[PDB]
Design a protein around this ligand. Structure first.
Ligand SMILES: O=S(=O)(O)c1cccc2cccc(Nc3ccccc3)c12
Ligand SMILES: O=S(=O)(O)c1cccc2cccc(Nc3ccccc3)c12
Ligand SMILES: COc1ccc(O)c(-c2nc(N)nc(N)n2)c1
Length: 302
């Protein structure tokens, strides 16, 4: 039986991702609470590009405990309403609420482990997230964390307006993208998650840049300016300039003080400059940092 928007009662705005406001709503017929996303389509040109349609189809095929569940898609007047399972809060809000104490290590480990499981699944199905950040990660009272707000629209020219509040995506952007690589790989998601891992541990974003070049320099100042030894081919990348300053790599004892050899070993592999050497999500799941991983239940108030 088709669902119609009249079937839903808005309860409250719970967020605003790359597609604007996200509303918690109640299904009038079943009483099920859901999250609704409003997509405004603009046939600016001929329509959604074939490749974009295929990528949307690929994302839709994914069924995994660590990917927010899309329950239905309602079409009406030049608009689409995405009906998703309802999740209480995002990782960004949770970290801010835990900033003065910090998210406990067992939870950090559980969330990282789960995000790697979700990414491994996506990557094996040829799906990348492309815009991983704390704001697009959803957590439930059960202790699960899920991927949401995939960067598909801006990555494949989907004719749909994006954004609402602003932008801060640069902070988690992989260096090969900042250097203008012709083709990037699944490794870009691992870099972003590595930045998130460090952020949960230190309680502060790792590379909070304000422009592409500022983002690059913040990365270089911490991990060292890459050269051909560390990253073969870096000096020939489209936007690489020999004039870049030369910074030496900093010790992780300074970058992420709380972490030990296991956590630092894993983080170093997730932030490797060379995409071909950066650890994969599948390999990361086998890292010793996860030997004692559990599934703690977070404490959240509303
Ligand atoms: O494939 S759908 O499940 O609709 C879909 C689901 C989720 C997001 C979408 C974004 C743009 C276009 C779609 N398709 C579309 C296709 C025909 C007409 C209007 C929109 C999207
Ligand atoms: O909303 S997201 O959380 O990314 C999302 C999460 C989980 C499954 C999705 C399936 C299709 C489209 C999405 N978003 C989408 C919306 C508009 C344009 C292109 C893709 C999906
Ligand atoms: C598909 O995107 C979704 C799907 C379901 C959701 O519950 C959310 C969401 N939920 C909350 N509480 N905050 C925020 N920021 N987002 C987002």
């Amino acid at each position: 039986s088709p669902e119609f928007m009249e079937n839903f009662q808005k309860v409250e705005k719970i967020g605003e991702g790359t597609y604007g406001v996200v509303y918690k709503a109640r299904n009038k017929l079943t009483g099920e609470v859901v999250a609704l996303k409003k997509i405004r389509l603009d046939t600016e040109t001929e329509g959604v590009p074939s490749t974009a349609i295929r990528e949307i189809s690929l994302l839709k095929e994914l069924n995994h405990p660590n990917i927010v569940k899309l329950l239905d898609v309602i079409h009406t007047e030049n608009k689409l309403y995405l009906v998703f399972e309802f999740l209480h809060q995002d990782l960004k809000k949770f970290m801010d609420a835990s900033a003065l104490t910090g998210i406990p290590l067992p939870l950090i480990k559980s969330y990282l482990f789960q995000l790697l499981q979700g990414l491994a699944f996506c990557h094996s199905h040829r799906v990348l997230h492309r815009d991983l950040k704390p704001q697009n990660l959803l957590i439930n009272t059960e202790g699960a964390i899920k991927l949401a707000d995939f960067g598909l629209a801006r990555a494949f020219g989907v004719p749909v307006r994006t954004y609402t509040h602003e932008v801060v995506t640069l902070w988690y952007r992989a260096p090969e993208i900042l250097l203008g690589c012709k083709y990037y790989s699944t490794a870009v998601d691992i870099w972003s998650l590595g930045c998130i891992f460090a952020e949960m541990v230190t309680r502060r974003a790792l590379f909070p840049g304000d422009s592409e070049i500022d983002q690059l320099f913040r990365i270089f100042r911490t991990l060292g300016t890459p050269d051909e030894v560390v990253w073969p081919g870096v000096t020939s990348m489209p936007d690489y300039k020999p004039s870049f300053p030369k910074w030496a790599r900093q010790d992780f004892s300074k970058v992420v003080p709380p972490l030990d050899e296991d956590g630092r070993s894993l983080l170093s592999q997730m932030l490797h400059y060379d995409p071909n050497k950066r650890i994969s999500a599948k390999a990361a799941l086998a890292h010793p940092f996860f030997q004692d991983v559990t599934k703690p239940v977070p404490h959240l108030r509303l």
